[PDB]
Symmetry: C3
Amino acid sequence: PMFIVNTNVPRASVPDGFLSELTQQLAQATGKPPQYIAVHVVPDQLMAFGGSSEPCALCSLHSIGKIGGAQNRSYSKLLCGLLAERLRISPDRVYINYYDMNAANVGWNNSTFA
Amino acid sequence: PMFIVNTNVPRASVPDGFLSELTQQLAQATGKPPQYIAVHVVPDQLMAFGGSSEPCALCSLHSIGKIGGAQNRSYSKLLCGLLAERLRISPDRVYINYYDMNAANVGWNNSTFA
Amino acid sequence: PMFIVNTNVPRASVPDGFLSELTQQLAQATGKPPQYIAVHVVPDQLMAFGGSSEPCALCSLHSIGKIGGAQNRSYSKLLCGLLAERLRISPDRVYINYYDMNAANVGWNNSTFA
Ligand SMILES: S=C=NCCCCCCc1ccccc1
Ligand SMILES: S=C=NCCCCCCc1ccccc1
Ligand SMILES: S=C=NCCCCCCc1ccccc1
């Protein structure tokens, strides 16, 4: 599972432990071992959401499976919750794109997961 | 709809108003209220297009619907037009990836659009 | 074909000529003229892989065709090879997402490749 968050929130406002918390909570949510979870936080971005530049985030979650109607609603509750708590971003200023990747289309360690 | 542009054009060459113009014009082009539209501009990137580091851009437009053959051609004319006028990037050094997102695969406000 | 590398490796550790090398190597690998190839390297990122912030990379390869089970395995060996050789990133700390793009969903030069 790979989670990326792009946000206009300043780097200094990203708290200690945020990548670790994301990793741990994604492990819990996706059922995957933390050793295979990747997280990427990109602060200080030039962004607007609804035409304004109050704190916002554009995110993506890629996963081989564990993507679907109910699962994505659960991820969104979790991830918006963390963004609101830790980065003070309102959940209604967050988009998260979910991608169900075919194992043959994810490269790792000189090969793919197929 | 979410629009991201990554470019090697420096920050100082991004004109005032650019995020707002992108928002307005995307609202016009997609027929969606600007409150729905997110835009993200990433300047100063280490990029090459055709092996050359002349100004270029790699972009994406994700949308829940309003993606298709003719529509994408129209978006490309619009967006290349804006990048050429505002950032002085040649349209033949622009790629724009279009993604038709399922509502269930876009999170927002603790849930999804499903 | 468009190749993006996001990494926590510092900018200074990205060798001169890396973008050109990626371009030439992808050109050979995809059997496409280098004029078609775009590359984007993003160093100094705040990233974790497996809960660790040792050097790692999250990458994507978008291509109109030339994506598939065996081809992706070949790309992974190639690209992990380059990342290990040039950026000193272990191949088991690299993910590469492969995307087979429809021609109608790639904008270029005021239109699309449709
Ligand atoms: S995207 C993200 N990760 C990329 C693919 C992860 C496969 C998990 C392997 C694995 C999963 C569960 C139990 C044992 C091993
Ligand atoms: S991405 C951008 N903005 C997000 C739009 C959320 C409302 C989708 C409406 C909608 C749902 C289903 C089919 C067509 C339209
Ligand atoms: S992404 C990268 N470079 C962009 C490629 C533009 C020409 C597509 C040719 C092409 C069209 C249809 C099927 C196969 C090949």
